[PDB]
Design a protein around this ligand. Structure first.
Ligand code: HEM
Ligand code: HEM
Ligand code: HEM
Ligand code: HEM
Lengths: 142, 146, 142, 146
């Protein structure tokens, strides 16, 4: 549960990070499939599912579009990501555990790229934010 | 799995170019700050009042250096990881009573701190070898209590 | 995130269960210390910390008083248990993981006692409820 | 720890008075209903539309019976748990790709279903021996992937 300074914090960082959202998404999604290969079955219908892959690149763009969407809806993550939750938690039946994974990979990709903006303080609020995302996305399970 | 030559190479490479002094203090600090319940166990350390008190606390710094030095011993012993950590295991699980989830929290912090120091050199493949290493050692700090 | 039928559900069960709240608390807290002895250090200042124990019995009464409190505040767990959160998450620095534990033990004690009221359906809503409790209690960490 | 005579006794006692037919169907059903993402892996089973479709699904029932029968083999082999589950492990972790957290979810359901069948006989001590047993077997279904 995001405080006013948590929101401010997420926003100032997204403001700096944002330019590279596509690079971040592609990079984050490739690390996920490569270091936690249990996650490759959700994308098994794609031809090429390797770090290069045009498939990986397009969808990394989409995921980060979902993070931007959530920065916008940070006052109500629950109603802001209800569509995404319907699809992930209800249609795709994505194992909740994968969200901790993808989230970790995103944090690693940001350390990679913006080592200097990614302070411990920023780290705390981005983490409460990614956890709130996950909880919001978990809405349609049960 | 069990070690590949490729992984042995990478892991030894990461540890031989690593600055313990820089990385250790930073991984622990961050762990104490992002997952603050963790501080319950570092009571004797002192001023942990807020994020900047932790970053400059010398007790924390020196102890971060020792977690790293403890990683180094499993590096030297990749085929005998569970017996090298027995002693550690016992201290963390029966003298100290640290939920095992915490070992995984400290690990993520070491990766995060390493990713920022290595930049683009910290490849998906290098991330994979390293998480394997830490997985295996997190199993050994817990292992005996279940 | 509790639906209207989740609240109804928790309420109809608490209505049946409630009479035995003290028995439930004592029983739940003894199982916790005995099966997950990593949790005994939080109560190490008590003389006797064994299933009999008058200490265990009094505090089991208090914990279940906190569950009753939460049934009452089920529309806003977050502000309803803010005092409890201050003490657990901020003063006691209780490891979040212990809440999954205690919660599990409570569910086991209820199966023990009200096998017939503890349906799968009741099980789902009590679980979303105990998770919401835990999240509410986690409020003052970071 | 490693097995005590007391635990061996209890565990063998629980499994010898257990009705596989009643408990198995119920533990799985409940798991599928309380943690519904779980159903992703039981796709071929069919009508899983809601809670009552699951409770009466015969595919689910028969499969619940087989999880129990798989527990029974570790009962018979308490000192060689990790090799008895190797095959299972491999199927669950590399053919199937089941997050290991799920094994812990299924377990909690078996305890919960057993607690209600045993009533007050399911003592703190009996709960402790049983969770030890399941802990150790959950380590073996995962064990090799990390
Ligand atoms: C962590 C935050 C996540 C966000 C913001 C997110 C966002 C998105 C978005 C925007 C789409 C859109 C495509 C559409 O509209 O059809 C999508 C699809 C998808 N997501 Fe995620 N997702 C997240 C996590 C996950 C995880 C962890 C997994 C799997 C382990 C996953 C599996 C999928 C799959 C399989 C699709 C469908 C793609 C396709 O059919 O080609 N998502 N997600
Ligand atoms: C994550 C992997 C970890 C490794 C490799 C590690 C390693 C070590 C080592 C090498 C020592 C010093 C041993 C000695 O000087 O006798 C130590 C002490 C300690 N560790 Fe860890 N540790 C880890 C995780 C954790 C976590 C997650 C916690 C959470 C609280 C923790 C809490 C402690 C405490 C309280 C001490 C003793 C501090 C003192 O009494 O001075 N450790 N650890
Ligand atoms: C799970 C839901 C829980 C609820 C509803 C709850 C409720 C309570 C209540 C009402 C008190 C009141 C005493 C006062 O007002 O000082 C309390 C105290 C306490 N709680 Fe909990 N608690 C929960 C979980 C936990 C867990 C999991 C632990 C430890 C593993 C824990 C550790 C403590 C301790 C150490 C105290 C202080 C008792 C004393 O100083 O004598 N609590 N809790
Ligand atoms: C929790 C401890 C568990 C035990 C002891 C266990 C045991 C077993 C056994 C004995 C089989 C049948 C093997 C055969 O006939 O060749 C099986 C199959 C299977 N298990 Fe588990 N299992 C466990 C947990 C899980 C969990 C948590 C999941 C979550 C999805 C799961 C998913 C599956 C699936 C999908 C199959 C194959 C079904 C089929 O293809 O007919 N298992 N398991």
């Amino acid at each position: 549960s995001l405080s006013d300074k948590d929101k401010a914090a997420v926003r100032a960082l997204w403001s700096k990070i944002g330019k590279s959202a596509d690079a971040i998404g592609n990079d984050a999604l490739s690390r996920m499939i490569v270091v936690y290969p249990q996650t490759k079955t959700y994308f098994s219908h794609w031809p090429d599912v390797t770090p290069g892959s045009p498939h990986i690149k397009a969808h990394g763009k989409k995921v980060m579009g979902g993070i931007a969407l959530a920065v916008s809806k940070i006052d109500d993550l629950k109603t802001g990501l209800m569509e995404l939750s319907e699809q992930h938690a209800y249609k795709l039946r994505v194992d909740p555990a994968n969200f901790k994974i993808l989230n970790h990979c995103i944090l690693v990709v940001i350390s990679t790229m913006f080592p200097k903006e990614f302070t411990p303080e920023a780290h705390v609020s981005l983490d409460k934010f990614l956890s709130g995302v996950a909880l919001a996305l978990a809405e349609r399970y049960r | 799995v069990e070690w590949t030559d490729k992984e042995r190479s990478i892991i030894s490479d990461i540890f031989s170019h690593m600055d313990y002094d820089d990385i250790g203090p930073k991984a622990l600090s961050r762990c104490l700050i992002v997952y603050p319940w963790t501080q319950r166990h570092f009571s004797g350390f002192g001023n942990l009042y807020n994020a900047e008190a932790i970053i400059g606390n010398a007790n924390v710094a020196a102890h971060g250096i020792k977690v790293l030095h403890g990683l180094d011993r499993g590096v030297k012993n990749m085929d005998n990881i569970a017996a090298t950590y027995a002693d550690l295991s016992t201290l963390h699980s029966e003298k100290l009573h640290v939920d095992p989830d915490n070992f995984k929290l400290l690990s993520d912090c070491i990766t995060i701190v390493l990713a920022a120091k290595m930049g683009h050199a910290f490849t998906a493949e290098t991330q994979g070898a390293f998480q394997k290493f830490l997985a295996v050692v997190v199993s050994a700090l817990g292992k005996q209590y279940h």
